[PDB]
Amino acid sequence: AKHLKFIARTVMVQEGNVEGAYRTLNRILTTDGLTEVISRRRYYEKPCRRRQRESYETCRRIYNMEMARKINFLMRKNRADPWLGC
Amino acid sequence: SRYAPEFREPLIDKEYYRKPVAELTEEEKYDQELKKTQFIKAAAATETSSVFADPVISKFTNMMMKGGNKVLARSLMAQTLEAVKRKQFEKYRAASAEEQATIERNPYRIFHEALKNCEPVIGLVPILKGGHFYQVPVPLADRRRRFLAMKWMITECRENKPRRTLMPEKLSHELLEAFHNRGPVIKRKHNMHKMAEANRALAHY
Amino acid sequence: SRFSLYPPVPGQESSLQWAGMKFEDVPIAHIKATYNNTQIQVVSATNASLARASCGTEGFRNAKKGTGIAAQTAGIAAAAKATGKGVTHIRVVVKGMGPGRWSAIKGLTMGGLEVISITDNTPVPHXGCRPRKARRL
Amino acid sequence: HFLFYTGKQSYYSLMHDVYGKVMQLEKHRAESRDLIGSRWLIKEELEEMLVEKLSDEDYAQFIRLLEKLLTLPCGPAEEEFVQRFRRSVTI
Amino acid sequence: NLLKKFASKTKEDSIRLRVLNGLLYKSLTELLCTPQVSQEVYDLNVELSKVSVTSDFSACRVYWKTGVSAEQNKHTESVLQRSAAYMRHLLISQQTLRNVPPIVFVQDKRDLVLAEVDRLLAEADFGPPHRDASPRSFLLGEE
RNA sequence: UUGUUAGGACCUAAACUCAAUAACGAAAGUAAUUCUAGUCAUUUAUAAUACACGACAGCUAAGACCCAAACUGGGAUUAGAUACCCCACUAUGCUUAGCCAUAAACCUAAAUAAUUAAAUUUAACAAAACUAUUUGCCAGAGAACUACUAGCCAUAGCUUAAAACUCAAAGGAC
Ligand SMILES: [Mg+2]
Ligand SMILES: [Mg+2]
Ligand SMILES: [Mg+2]
Ligand SMILES: [Mg+2]
Ligand SMILES: [Mg+2]
Ligand SMILES: [Mg+2]
Numbered sequence: 001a002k003h004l005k006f007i008a009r010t011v012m013v014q015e016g017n018v019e020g021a022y023r024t025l026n027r028i029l030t031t032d033g034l035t036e037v038i039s040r041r042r043y044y045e046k047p048c049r050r051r052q053r054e055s056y057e058t059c060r061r062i063y064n065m066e067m068a069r070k071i072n073f074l075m076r077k078n079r080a081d082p083w084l085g086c
Numbered sequence: 087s088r089y090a091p092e093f094r095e096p097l098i099d100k101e102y103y104r105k106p107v108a109e110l111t112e113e114e115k116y117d118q119e120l121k122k123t124q125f126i127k128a129a130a131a132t133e134t135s136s137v138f139a140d141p142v143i144s145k146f147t148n149m150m151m152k153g154g155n156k157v158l159a160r161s162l163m164a165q166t167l168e169a170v171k172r173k174q175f176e177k178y179r180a181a182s183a184e185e186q187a188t189i190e191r192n193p194y195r196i197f198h199e200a201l202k203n204c205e206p207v208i209g210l211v212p213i214l215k216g217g218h219f220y221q222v223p224v225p226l227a228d229r230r231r232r233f234l235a236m237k238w239m240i241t242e243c244r245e246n247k248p249r250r251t252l253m254p255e256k257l258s259h260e261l262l263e264a265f266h267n268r269g270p271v272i273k274r275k276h277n278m279h280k281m282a283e284a285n286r287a288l289a290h291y
Numbered sequence: 292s293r294f295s296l297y298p299p300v301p302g303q304e305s306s307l308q309w310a311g312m313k314f315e316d317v318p319i320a321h322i323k324a325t326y327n328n329t330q331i332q333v334v335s336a337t338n339a340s341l342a343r344a345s346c347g348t349e350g351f352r353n354a355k356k357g358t359g360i361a362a363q364t365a366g367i368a369a370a371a372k373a374t375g376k377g378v379t380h381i382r383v384v385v386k387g388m389g390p391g392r393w394s395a396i397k398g399l400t401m402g403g404l405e406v407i408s409i410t411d412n413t414p415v416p417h418x419g420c421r422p423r424k425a426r427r428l
Numbered sequence: 429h430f431l432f433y434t435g436k437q438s439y440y441s442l443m444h445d446v447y448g449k450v451m452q453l454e455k456h457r458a459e460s461r462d463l464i465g466s467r468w469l470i471k472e473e474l475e476e477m478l479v480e481k482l483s484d485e486d487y488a489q490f491i492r493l494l495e496k497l498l499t500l501p502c503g504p505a506e507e508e509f510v511q512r513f514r515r516s517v518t519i
Numbered sequence: 520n521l522l523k524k525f526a527s528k529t530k531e532d533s534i535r536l537r538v539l540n541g542l543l544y545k546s547l548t549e550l551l552c553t554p555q556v557s558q559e560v561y562d563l564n565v566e567l568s569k570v571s572v573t574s575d576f577s578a579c580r581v582y583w584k585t586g587v588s589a590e591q592n593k594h595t596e597s598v599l600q601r602s603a604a605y606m607r608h609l610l611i612s613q614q615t616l617r618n619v620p621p622i623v624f625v626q627d628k629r630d631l632v633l634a635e636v637d638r639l640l641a642e643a644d645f646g647p648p649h650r651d652a653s654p655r656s657f658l659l660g661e662e
Numbered sequence: 663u664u665g666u667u668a669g670g671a672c673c674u675a676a677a678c679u680c681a682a683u684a685a686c687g688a689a690a691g692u693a694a695u696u697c698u699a700g701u702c703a704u705u706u707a708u709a710a711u712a713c714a715c716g717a718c719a720g721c722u723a724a725g726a727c728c729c730a731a732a733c734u735g736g737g738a739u740u741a742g743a744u745a746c747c748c749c750a751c752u753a754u755g756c757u758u759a760g761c762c763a764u765a766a767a768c769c770u771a772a773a774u775a776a777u778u779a780a781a782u783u784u785a786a787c788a789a790a791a792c793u794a795u796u797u798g799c800c801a802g803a804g805a806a807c808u809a810c811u812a813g814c815c816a817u818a819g820c821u822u823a824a825a826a827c828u829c830a831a832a833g834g835a836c
């Protein structure tokens with residue numbers, strides 16, 4: 001309300017591709033976490049539930065990264081059988 | 087079936103086998119060489135290379151047959167074609183030169199164009215939802231659309247005719263009356279389409 | 292020598308002009324997309340109202356008032372009123388995150404208005420008012 | 429037989445020979461369709477040659493090794509060998 | 520205990536199921552209109568016919584409007600199903616419903632049929648207007 | 663009433679991202695910014711009948727009041743709705759003074775110093791096991807977060823806490 005208007009959250013349309021501008025603005029507002037914030041802020045999440053949710057996300061992200069690491073660590077060993085017949 | 091699944095339907099087209107080799111598309115050319123190493127089903131009793139054999143009329147004959155009496159059903163269709171040819175010959179001779187041009191005296195061409203005029207584009211399949219009968223607009227295949235035209239003709243003549251009239255005389259009068267798009271069978275097609283329009287909203291169900 | 296997604300900077304000199312208008316002058320299309328009704332208002336850069344529309348005024352009612360096709364009609368209606376008043380280029384500030392958020396912008400394009408930019412003004416409090424309690428269903 | 433304790437001395441004795449052939453061809457270094465209208469022997473026929481029960485995985489692995497032998501340069505000894513495991517398709 | 524935790528190897532219903540079905544459809548439609556679920560899911564531009572929750576509440580079936588191309592539909596099916604487990608999370612986390620059933624994605628080719636009928640219908644010719652267990656037998660010599 | 667305002671006023675309430683962080687505090691608890699005051703050495707463990715604290719809800723008095731919201735009213739829903747869903751609104755959540763002293767007040771782990779081998783899965787599951795030291799506490803279940811007693815700003819309250827009588831189980835982990 002005190003800042004300058006049209007600098008924040010503003011994308012510019014290139015060659016009349018109005019849909020591409022909107023679709024990019026969505027990817028911006030989602031990468032920055034504004035989309036999740038607006039959705040969650042519709043109803044009150046109680047402090048105990050917020051902490052349970054954030055602790056679960058962190059442990060969920062750690063387990064998904066390590067499991068990807070194990071799969072990607074053995075991505076190179078998946079090759080044609082060198083010892084076919086034995 | 088007594089034919090193993092490896093058996094192939096026979097091809098009874100006289101011109102196809104005698105065509106020059108170069109005139110055949112490579113897809114058709116491939117099938118010929120393949121069929122040399124396959125099993126071929128024996129041809130049916132009603133399958134011949136005759137130039138007078140029409141598949142549409144042959145199908146119409148079987149849909150009239152009762153209890154395997156093919157001789158009678160074929161006789162009725164033969165009498166029908168003749169009854170239509172004789173009805174157009176009378177009209178042609180008793181018409182002016184200008185009118186004579188339009189008059190069609192080929193029974194095979196009146197039969198095909200009659201059936202086509204009675205074929206319905208869309209259909210109605212009756213469904214039951216929530217304890218009521220909601221029939222909904224449906225689209226019909228080329229096989230279902232043709233069957234309905236033939237079935238509606240064989241049923242108008244069988245039922246809605248005087249007691250002493252015969253099928254060759256009622257069917258001839260309907261193929262010609264349908265051929266002009268004014269028969270009762272045409273009304274059956276019109277009623278099917280008009281109901282589908284009414285049930286446009288119920289298509290979702 | 293490439294296109295810039297970032298808008299022109301107010302108070303500077305730019306080569307971007309639309310119909311002989313600078314960016315600060317192009318009229319603004321304010322879209323309030325809520326979960327029930329999508330309202331649209333078009334104003335000049337001096338804050339003078341030119342067109343107004345919404346799913347309700349078009350004639351949609353209750354749950355239909357909050358559909359994508361309902362908002363599209365509202366945008367086409369606002370475009371026509373704006374086009375009559377003499378508007379060809381609009382800056383789209385879309386508040387709200389409802390179903391007709393995009394459809395309202397699509398209707399404005401179908402109505403003959405040329406969108407040059409899309410801004411977002413969805414209210415995001417920084418810590419604010421306690422939201423209503425969660426629904427139990 | 430030195431492969432007795434494997435439990436399939438005849439299957440593995442054959443897979444030992446074909447794997448040694450493959451190694452000599454690969455170390456040492458034309459059209460491979462010397463024979464046409466032929467098929468690989470079915471598992472039942474192979475089991476008869478070995479005189480021992482084989483599984484589907486054992487048959488599938490045996491064929492892959494024989495295919496690799498054909499891919500490589502083959503002297504007349506190899507062609508005669510793979511011939512034993514090729515049965516003329518019924519005509 | 521992370522590995523232990525996340526391995527995870529081991530008339531009332533009528534009115535309740537007319538609210539969950541409506542709300543779940545309202546909510547899942549919003550989820551797919553943004554990249555929140557994924558960028559792949561956002562680009563598919565999928566539409567939802569309706570949501571049907573089972574009477575047992577074992578599963579939540581979401582009907583999405585299938586298209587013409589089988590390849591387009593086969594791709595959309597795989598992407599939608601892989602993310603269904605994640606979509607359920609987002610609905611519990613925004614507090615749409617406290618408990619949500621496993622989401623299943625079913626195809627809805629009905630929208631194609633309705634378009635076909637209207638095509639033919641416009642073109643149609645309407646026409647003119649203990650004993651055994653115990654050792655007693657063993658210890659007596661009977662056995 | 664609504665929408666817009668690069669108009670004005672207000673300074674109520676709460677502190678996005680950072681935070682995928684794991685800091686501070688005895689615990690309760692604490693994360694908008696700045697500044698002021700401020701945590702610190704007892705060898706270590708070991709304390710009540712004393713002292714000082716103690717989420718939320720609640721009580722008392724004077725204020726505040728954006729938003730939320732027991733209760734209450736309205737609307738719908740249903741065989742019934744005394745609920746769930748929708749609208750309005752109050753106690754209350756805030757401040758200033760007291761009071762009350764309750765939580766799954768939980769890391770369901772007393773503190774402290776060891777050791778990792780004692781051929782210890784010494785049940786199982788949690789959180790690998792185990793020695794020593796000091797204090798508190800426990801001795802089948804139900805009756806019983808009860809009765810009586812004493813203390814307390816507490817008066818439908820908290821702490822302390824039995825017996826009769828009944829059963830042959832109750833209970834825990836897989
Ligand atoms: Mg304040
Ligand atoms: Mg200081
Ligand atoms: Mg109040
Ligand atoms: Mg705990
Ligand atoms: Mg108590
Ligand atoms: Mg008591």
Ligand SMILES: [Mg+2]
């Ligand atoms: Mg007492």
Ligand SMILES: [Mg+2]
């Ligand atoms: Mg006792």
